[PDB]
């Protein structure tokens, strides 16, 4: 799994010694977070389940 | 085979852990990229 | 600059270390952590 965004994190102080972080900017390749699953591995799983059900 | 389905995943920052309404924890965003690998062990199904 | 289309660039006011002085900064957020009432 991944969040493929090169991201810049900046810091500020909101009050009497209270730091805070925020997403400043991203460097420029706007993507979407995702996860890969091996396909043939997953079908091999579900055949075991219906075998018992 | 030699294939990989891929899921759309979203990002949130304001969570409510264990549905305890009133408590709101903020997620500090972190720098660099994100990679984490995990096994699959347990599943929940509902008849 | 132009294109089609999960981020919001947000005008934002805030306090400072001192009690009276304000702070006009900007940041980014996602979709599901902010709500319309622009």
């Amino acid at each position, epitope marked *: 799994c991944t969040r493929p965004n090169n991201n810049t994190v900046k810091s500020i102080r909101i009050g009497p010694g209270q730091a805070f972080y925020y997403t400043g900017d991203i460097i420029g390749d706007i*993507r979407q977070a*995702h996860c890969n699953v091996s396909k043939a591995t997953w079908n091999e799983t579900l055949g075991k389940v219906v075998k018992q059900l | 085979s030699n294939d990989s389905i*891929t899921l759309p995943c979203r990002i949130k920052q304001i969570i409510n852990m264990w549905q305890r309404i009133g408590q709101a924890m903020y997620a500090p965003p972190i720098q660099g990229v994100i990679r984490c690998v995990s096994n699959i062990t347990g599943l929940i199904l509902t008849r | 600059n132009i*294109t*089609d289309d999960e981020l919001k660039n947000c005008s934002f006011n805030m306090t400072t270390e001192l009690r009276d002085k304000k702070q006009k900064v900007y940041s980014l957020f996602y979709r599901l952590d902010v709500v319309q009432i622009k």
Partner: antibody, heavy 129, light 106 residues
Framework: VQLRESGPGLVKPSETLSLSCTVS?????????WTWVRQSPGKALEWIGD???????TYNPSLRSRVRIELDQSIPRFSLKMTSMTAADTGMYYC???????????????????????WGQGTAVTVSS | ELTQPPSVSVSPGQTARITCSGA??????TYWYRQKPGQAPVLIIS???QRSSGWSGRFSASWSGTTVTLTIRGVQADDEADYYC???????????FGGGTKLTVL
């Protein structure tokens, strides 16, 4: 990158159309888009259709009932099947490469069209008798 | 569809601007081409990644409403051709062209 069209030159009315466009010197031929666009004399351009190597095709919906675009990938040459030729379709026809670059998962639509960089020879499509 | 001026007249040396208008240009991206008469079209403005202004070399383009202005800096007498804006629909189903715009150079 080279490309060359292929045409008969003179086509009778009410017959069909067989065109193709051969591509060479392409290090990644497999990840572009391939399209036909025609042009009438003294007129604007006229998009026809497109093909990608998965097999997915779209078309101009007004012209869709008479056209078909197919593909060989061993020889990087994609074809063109227009039926029912009329004299109003006399013009200058083009094959073109529409490039796509990738910023992530192809199956999630994390790509964008670069733009149509490479344009064909042009062919004097003459529908006459 | 799209909307263009039919012809634009300018002397050499000045800055000619062509406004491609149209209903799909609320959202989608605009192409540009050049075609000499008797020869092939030429892509003249392509794009990089989305937050990168596409590409800025010799030409540029701005956006305001449904109008897209085609800025030509440093007009000389050799760029005489016919010009075309291109986009697709917001539904992303089919691809249309501009009407066509002649460059008139004094």
């Amino acid at each position: 990158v080279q490309l060359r069209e292929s045409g008969p030159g003179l086509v009778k009315p009410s017959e069909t159309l067989s065109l193709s466009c051969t591509v060479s010197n392409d290090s990644r031929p497999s990840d572009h888009s391939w399209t036909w666009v025609r042009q009438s004399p003294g007129k604007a351009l006229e998009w026809i259709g497109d093909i990608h190597y998965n097999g997915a095709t779209t078309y101009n919906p007004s012209l869709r009932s008479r056209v078909r675009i197919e593909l060989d990938q061993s020889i990087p040459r994609f074809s063109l099947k227009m039926t029912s030729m009329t004299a109003a379709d006399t013009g200058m026809y083009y094959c073109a490469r529409n490039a796509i670059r990738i910023y992530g998962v192809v199956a999630l639509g994390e790509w964008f069209h670069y733009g149509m960089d490479v344009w064909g020879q042009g062919t004097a499509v003459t529908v006459s008798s | 569809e799209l909307t263009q001026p039919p012809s634009v007249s300018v002397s050499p040396g000045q800055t000619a601007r062509i406004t491609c208008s149209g209903a799909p240009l609320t959202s989608r991206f605009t192409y540009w081409y050049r075609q000499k008469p008797g020869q092939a079209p030429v892509l003249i403005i392509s794009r990089s990644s989305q937050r990168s202004s596409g590409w800025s070399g010799r030409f540029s383009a701005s956006w305001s409403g449904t109008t897209v202005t085609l800025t030509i800096r440093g007009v000389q007498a050799d760029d005489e051709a016919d010009y075309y804006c291109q986009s697709s629909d917001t539904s992303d189903s089919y691809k249309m062209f501009g009407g066509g715009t002649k460059l008139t150079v004094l």
